[PDB]
Amino acid sequence: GRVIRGQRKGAGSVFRAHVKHRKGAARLRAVDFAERHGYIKGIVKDIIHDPGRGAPLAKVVFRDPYRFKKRTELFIAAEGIHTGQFVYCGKKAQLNIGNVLPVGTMPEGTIVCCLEEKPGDRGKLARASGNYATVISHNPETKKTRVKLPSGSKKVISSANRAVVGVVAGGGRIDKPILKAGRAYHKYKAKRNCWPRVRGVAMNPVEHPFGGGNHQHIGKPSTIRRDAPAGRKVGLIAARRTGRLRGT
Amino acid sequence: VQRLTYRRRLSYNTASNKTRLSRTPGNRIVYLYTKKVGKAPKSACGVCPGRLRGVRAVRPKVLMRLSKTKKHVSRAYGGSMCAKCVRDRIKRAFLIEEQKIVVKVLKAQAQSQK
Amino acid sequence: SSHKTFRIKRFLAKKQKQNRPIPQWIWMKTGNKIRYNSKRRHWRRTKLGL
Amino acid sequence: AKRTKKVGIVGKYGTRYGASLRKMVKKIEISQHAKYTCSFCGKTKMKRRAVGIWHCGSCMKTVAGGAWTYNTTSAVTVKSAIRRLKELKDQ
RNA sequence: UCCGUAGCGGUCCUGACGUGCGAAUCGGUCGUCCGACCUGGGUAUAGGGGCGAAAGACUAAUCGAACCAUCUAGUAGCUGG
RNA sequence: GUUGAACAUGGGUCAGUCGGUCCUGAGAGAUGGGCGAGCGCCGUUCCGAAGGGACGGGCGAUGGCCUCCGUUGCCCUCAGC
RNA sequence: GACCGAUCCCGGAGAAGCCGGCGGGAGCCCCGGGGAGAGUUCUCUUUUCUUUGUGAAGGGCAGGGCGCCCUGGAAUGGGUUCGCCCCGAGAGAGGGGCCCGUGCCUUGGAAAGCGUCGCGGUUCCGGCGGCGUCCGGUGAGCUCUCGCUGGCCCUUGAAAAUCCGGGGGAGAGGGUGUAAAUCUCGCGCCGGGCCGUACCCAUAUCCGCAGCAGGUCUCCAAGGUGAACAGCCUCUGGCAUGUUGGAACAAUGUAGGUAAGGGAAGUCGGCAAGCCGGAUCCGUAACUUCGGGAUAAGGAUUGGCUCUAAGGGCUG
RNA sequence: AGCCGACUUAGAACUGGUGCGGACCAGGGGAAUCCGACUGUUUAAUUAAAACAAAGCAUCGCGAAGGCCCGCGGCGGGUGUU
RNA sequence: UAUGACUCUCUUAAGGUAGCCAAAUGCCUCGUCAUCUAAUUAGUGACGCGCAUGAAUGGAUGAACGAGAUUCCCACUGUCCCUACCUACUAUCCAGCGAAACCACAGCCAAGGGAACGGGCUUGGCGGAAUCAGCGGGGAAAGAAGACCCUGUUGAGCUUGA
RNA sequence: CCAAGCGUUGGAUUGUUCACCCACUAAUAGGGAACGUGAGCUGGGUUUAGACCGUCGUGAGACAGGUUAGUUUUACCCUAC
């Protein structure tokens, strides 16, 4: 049969991301002597809107400790950050909103965002709009810290990785209903060619394993095993249960 | 009414293909291809929405032609920053430097008794 | 178009010069078989490729 | 006079999208377009620019806030928790 | 959002035409016309592949597997000489 | 048809300022490297000793009112992308 | 009118969406007169038509804008827009400053151009002359452009070449003069190489086998009627009826119409055709997601002519 | 008080063989049923639809040495400037 | 009288709940009743015993919307009773220019027989140059080596417990 | 019985053939002609490709089971008239 739509996305060249008007890779400042043994001070110049992203970005300017230069970084803006505000970075930095420091310094129950899953990778966890992570517990021997990720799954990270304090700005974004197809078109035109989703039951059997028949119906269990070949692995992949969520 | 045509091969109404009407010594109406409107410099402070005064608003390669007095204001940070954010930075640079002297004095005041 | 390149204009120049009839004196020759120019081209009929 | 009896902002949507969806989006479309007071200059000129971005017309101060409101109750409580934990750590 | 022009499209007459103006056009009547709108140029994706608001549609008048050359004078218990 | 976009003879396109030329866009595409039986392919900063430059000084020579600049040879110095 | 300064650093310009409203300036149109030349004149018409100007660049002045400055301190709150909006983080009120000035005047520049009349060259002439190219008023007008302000986005609407300003102060220059280093000021000198440039651009120069009713991206956009870039007529400009003419006016066609009386009885089926239609005045149901339905449905009026009333600026 | 100008609105009288949006331009209407919410899209050349899409609703996988997918192959590639 | 809440029995993982219906879904069927008509296999509203309705293989409803499907009414009309007349371009004729499809030979019928529907054969009827404008009965008229059906030890698209 | 000379209608419903009803009438008889008649029409039904429902099938799909939309070409030749 024909190669299916979900298979065709990995080749690229149509389904690639629309990154023309994006402002850059939003990440934390790289770790150095100042941010490892003390703190460095920077200033929030402006807060910009990144296309295809509900979170706003903050352009923070530091000064280089080794060269007479001003360094520009794009942080993900914690909610409450304004311009002219000084953002501090490092182990000895105090605990305020918009102030990145390692998670082993802050107490238990601290609300963070732009958390690092590995030490020094400039922020990977809890960085979508309105999302945050919570510090559960520490472990001073072997340098480990337990955090609660925004999916609820708890992760043990190293004690030396960095996270900026606060929630991500732009929360409640999924609260407003998209009223019409046009706003969804404009939303996904800024991200990628994925939006006008045709159901597999509306297709032909050459096009999808769900297509065909004189009635629009699946005709086979939509729950599929994890180790299924591509072109077959559609529907509900590796599903433990498939029903209306009652209880927990 | 004399309808008029373009004088160049670009037949599309783009941003560079902008014209204006002109009356001629031969008593006829011609197109004159205008230049783009210039902009005065924005202040280096980054907060003032207005543009700077005393500097002519021209295209960037016209600033080669102009003399220096047409391009700046006789002041510190003149032609690059507005006077409000110059004096508000003079006050800031003076006052934080004064407060550092106060902190240095109060450090030795504590170390004298202790 | 009027926005030609040098190589295209030179190719058009050669194909302009090959589009003339045969001289009258060539078929008074002894070993001659040519009656006319059979490689002729009209701008409306044959569109020269390109 | 009073133009509409129960629809406000969502009267522009006419007779479409469902009454309950219009009633849902009415709160967002009021709070999104309302002009808030500024915490820096005191003027009521804090207006939304994009999601998370709220700009003051007089002070030229832009703040990272919520998507449809200037402040979110999910972050005010976080601000309180961070100041109490900051006081707890330093004692 | 409604009537409606340019533009875009193509309901009905199952009208005209149907060795036609035309290997899909014409007339009246029609749908839409500030937005999921229309459009030039540049660029990306190539055949069991692409691309598809999904009709097995489109992919140079060729599509339920394009076109060109070769294997190839492929085989035919079948048809005609 | 005494006519033509037909045929036959001859002519006709003049630029510092109008465009190309220059820049980058989506993208294309070498080298290093990797893969590959192989034509080659991938990849565009990624496993790279990736700068042939400049000011000031010291050294050396050249040529002219050998006055004072200029020239190149070497070293010290400085340099992001 | 200049007004030294490098490595280095900071910033700006290039460099920004869509829509609505308002204001300014052009071009075109409009009205009232002066000229010049034409048209009508059977009767009337101080009548009708055409034309009646100034480039780039520089200087000056209007005009427009300012989220620029100084004085001063405002509630009995004021200022102000079409809407908004602004103000003890300084409003009004006075006085200044800057930007754009595509508008006017001047240099260009009347020498040239155009209209009209007349002389030459018997003609081969950027030929020579006489006059004129004037004074005003208006606009929810149309187009272009500039500016102000607002709305929309789970849409925030390019980069680089290139150019400039500033912060720093390594350095350089002269000892009181035929002063020096230096200059983004005014002139003066030389140069700008290579390629394209004709014509068609579409019911005949392109693609459809063709001079094929098909297709193919843009700029300009007069008068009247009228809401209108609708339809109809006209001016500038253009063309010859779309690969032929003449004579007949039969049927059947194709494209248009009209029909007494009845009004879907025709037909699978109101197919096709027909009715209605703009604007003003009233009037408007069931149902509903209260937004709609809605031009619901329903009626009345509409010409021409002669008047009246109301709706404004300028000056003292 | 004087001088200037732009289009409108309303009312009245008179008047034509009741004709007057005189050409042009220019919605037939109502009571109901079935289906699809709607705007949009679709078989270029027999099907414009009740088909597709759509917002809303609801499940499924994945915390990155990962989920889904591409690739003959690489410390390869897309989502991912996530 | 009937229907029959209730009971018994057989049973599978339950035995179709709320709704809804001769529906775009009901064979019987033009189901029965009411309404709409003078007359209705159509329409609408009820009835449910439902061959074979039914709850995100979504059920029921429902404003606005629709070049979607259906029924009725007002108004309107050549759709019709029942046709007629006029206009334009053809068709007609002429001057000039000028193809193509198709073609065993060709072309008047009745009956017989025949490969079971003759232009030709048999027996009868009979038949007369060359042509023009129409016309659609025939040429089992033309186009296209039937797409329906069957066979082939011929294939392709798609599916799966081959 | 001789007898086909002359007539045998207008409508609601259904694509219908058939059927059933209303009304008029003199009677509203039955049939054939390639189940007369598509280069005469129409395309309602049937009978391609698009879709929806019910049943069946794991599925692709099937259903003289419903529903909707779905290109009707040519005479100028010979004969007959």
Ligand SMILES: [Mg+2]
């Ligand atoms: Mg798209």
Ligand SMILES: [Mg+2]
């Ligand atoms: Mg399908």
Ligand SMILES: [Mg+2]
């Ligand atoms: Mg499959």
Ligand SMILES: [Mg+2]
């Ligand atoms: Mg089943």
Ligand SMILES: [Mg+2]
């Ligand atoms: Mg250009």
Ligand SMILES: [Mg+2]
């Ligand atoms: Mg002028």
Ligand SMILES: [Mg+2]
């Ligand atoms: Mg100046």
Ligand SMILES: [Mg+2]
């Ligand atoms: Mg051609």
Ligand SMILES: [Mg+2]
């Ligand atoms: Mg609309």
Ligand SMILES: [Mg+2]
């Ligand atoms: Mg409309």
Ligand SMILES: [Mg+2]
């Ligand atoms: Mg037709």
Ligand SMILES: [Mg+2]
């Ligand atoms: Mg014909």
Ligand SMILES: [Mg+2]
């Ligand atoms: Mg023709």
Ligand SMILES: [Mg+2]
């Ligand atoms: Mg591939």
Ligand SMILES: [Mg+2]
């Ligand atoms: Mg599409």
Ligand SMILES: [Mg+2]
């Ligand atoms: Mg199909």
